[PDB]
């Protein structure tokens, strides 16, 4: 029943966990608790096999642990700044080489998989700070420049015409802008990691920078110069939709250093670089 | 199935590309790779005919390459300026002789066809710059004056009554104005190019200016004079809908000079006027 299917989504009971059955004392030469970790397989022993359990009807569900749920929350991926200090023409526009590597929180989550395929929902939170008092009428333009398209070099560059590129215009006082993007790779999935180069010489680049070119995000204050200077900070949020992930991996254990690389720093006292807390000894809980 | 039709639109799989079939070594006096370009026809040879190919199931679609998609994106076509400097009555209104020739990006796309028939979606992005501090309550009026209708000569001209013309009033703080226009020509299609004159003498006009009269766009700040001066820049965006195009042509190779004409400038070193990059020689990739 596609309606029975719907009731489960509303209650979040699509993926139920198994019940615990009653077990009894045993005496046999079948020893489930014994095994060999050398095989590379996890012992599949359950509680009913080691202790005498009662019958319990499980109600827990795994819905929230699904990949869709784990990566399906908007997180910040960039904070764009347009600060008018002394030259409107030079300070009223900027650009950003798109990527999901600059903010640790969402980067770590996606990097718990080797490959991932998903659509994206971008939400923008612009905030205009009045440095001199008034803010006037702020209108912003965010333009997606795919690799190859002309990048604007002045606030009146012809590229802002956006004859083919996608642009979103936002007016101060209106709701936060938002839009969807389909899976963009030229491959079947995005590479969270890439053990490869863009050539075979000592000067070839290594890593995801080779495969994850997403283009540039160009933005500008559409409004022309005003008497009072403002500082506009636009925060970009990303969320994955219709997600699929492959080959899970160990979580990032040390701070990130740069984008597109697994490089890290290490101090003289390494225990400070990882989340592991020193134990007094083996028996001090 | 009109529902099967719909699933294809959502997935964008309406126009699929053919598969590559497996081919085998051959020896015959049928030589597909040989032909005669003099005929004016393109050799219709496919990869299966020159090499031994494997069978591949193509998933690509041509939807995005459709004419509807190519010309169906909003691009800027005009930037109207109302700058209050020292005389409100003279500077609070203006007019524009409508055309799609002033902005290179969309002009070049439409000019890849000789004729085109389409409806238009106009979207306006107004931005009020506070030159003295406050902006007050800005209300704008954009009026379409078809050829022949009276053009206002003062901010209080009777023509602003708009008894029959179409006017759009916008209030600062409200969403960007937008409206549709049906195909407007007195002919079956718009002329992207016109090898004709409006007479047969040495003083007759030549080109699309003869056939593409679209009327005038008159605008004014409805709000009466305020203490603080403002500069209102309204950017007009255009998008084609329900499009049809005929007789494709070579893309514009040099910068545009003026509206309604193919005229161009040429410097002493022509390679700088075209996108062609000089090669060192025939064998330097």
């Amino acid at each position: 029943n596609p309606v029975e299917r719907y009731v489960d989504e509303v209650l979040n009971e699509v993926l139920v966990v198994p019940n615990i059955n009653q077990s009894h004392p045993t005496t046999s030469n079948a020893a489930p608790v014994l095994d060999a970790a050398e095989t590379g397989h996890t012992n599949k022993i359950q509680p009913e096999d080691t202790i005498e359990t009662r019958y319990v009807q499980s109600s827990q569900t795994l819905d929230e642990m699904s990949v869709e749920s784990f990566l399906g929350r908007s997180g910040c991926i960039h904070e764009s700044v347009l600060d008018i200090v002394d030259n409107y023409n030079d300070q009223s526009f900027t650009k950003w080489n798109i990527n999901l590597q600059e903010m640790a929180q969402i980067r770590r989550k996606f990097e718990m998989f080797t490959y991932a395929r998903f659509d994206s929902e971008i939400t923008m939170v612009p905030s205009v700070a009045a440095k001199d008092g008034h803010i006037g009428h702020i209108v912003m333009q965010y333009m997606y420049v795919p690799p190859g398209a002309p990048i604007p070099t002045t606030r009146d560059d012809y590229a802002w015409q956006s004859g083919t590129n996608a642009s979103v215009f936002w007016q101060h006082g209106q709701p936060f802008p938002r839009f969807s993007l389909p899976f963009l790779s030229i491959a079947s999935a995005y590479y969270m990691f890439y053990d490869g180069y863009d050539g075979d010489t000592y000067k070839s680049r290594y890593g995801t920078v080779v495969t994850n070119d997403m283009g540039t995000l160009c933005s500008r204050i559409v409004t022309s110069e005003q008497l009072h200077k403002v500082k506009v900070v636009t925060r970009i949020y990303h969320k994955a939709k219709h997600t699929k992930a492959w080959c899970p991996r160990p979580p990032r254990a040390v701070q990130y250093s740069h984008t597109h690389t697994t490089n890290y720093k290490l101090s003289s006292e390494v225990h400070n670089d990882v989340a592991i807390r020193p134990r007094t000894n083996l028996t001090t809980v | 199935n009109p529902v099967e039709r719909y699933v294809d639109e959502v997935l964008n799989e309406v126009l699929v590309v053919p598969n590559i079939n497996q081919s085998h070594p051959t020896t015959s006096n049928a030589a597909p790779v040989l032909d005669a370009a003099e005929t004016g026809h393109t050799n219709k040879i496919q990869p299966e005919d020159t090499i031994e190919t494997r069978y591949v199931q193509s998933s690509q679609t041509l939807d995005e390459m459709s004419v509807e998609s190519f010309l169906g994106r909003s691009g800027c076509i005009h930037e109207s300026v109302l700058d209050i400097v020292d005389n409100y009555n003279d500077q609070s209104f203006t007019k524009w002789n409508i055309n799609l020739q002033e902005m290179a990006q969309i002009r070049r796309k439409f000019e890849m066809f000789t004729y085109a028939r389409f409806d238009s979606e106009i979207t306006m992005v107004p931005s009020v710059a506070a030159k003295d501090g406050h902006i007050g309550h800005i209300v704008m009026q954009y009026m379409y004056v078809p050829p022949g209708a009276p053009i206002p000569t003062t901010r209080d001209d009777y023509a602003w009554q708009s008894g029959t013309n179409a006017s759009v009033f916008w209030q600062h703080g409200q969403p960007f104005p937008r409206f549709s226009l049906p195909f407007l020509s007195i002919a079956s299609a718009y002329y992207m190019f016109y090898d004709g004159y409006d007479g047969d003498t040495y003083k007759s006009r030549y080109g699309t200016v003869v056939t593409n009269d679209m009327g005038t766009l008159c605008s004014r700040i409805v709000t009466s004079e305020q203490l603080h001066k403002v500069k209102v820049v309204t950017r007009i965006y255009h998008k084609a809908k329900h499009t049809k195009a005929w007789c494709p042509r070579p893309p514009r190779a040099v910068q545009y000079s003026h509206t309604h004409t193919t005229n161009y400038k040429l410097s002493s070193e022509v390679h700088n006027d075209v996108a062609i990059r000089p090669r060192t020689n025939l064998t330097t990739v």
Partner: peptide
């Protein structure tokens, strides 16, 4: 366009835009 189901408790599952990327979170399982 949307998928209507009946049993009576109808599940009008609307898709307001013409692209798949536009819809919300996917169903599980």
């Amino acid at each position: 366009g949307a998928q209507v189901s009946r049993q009576s408790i109808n599940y009008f599952n609307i898709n307001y835009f013409k692209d798949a990327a536009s819809s919300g979170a996917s169903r599980l399982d």
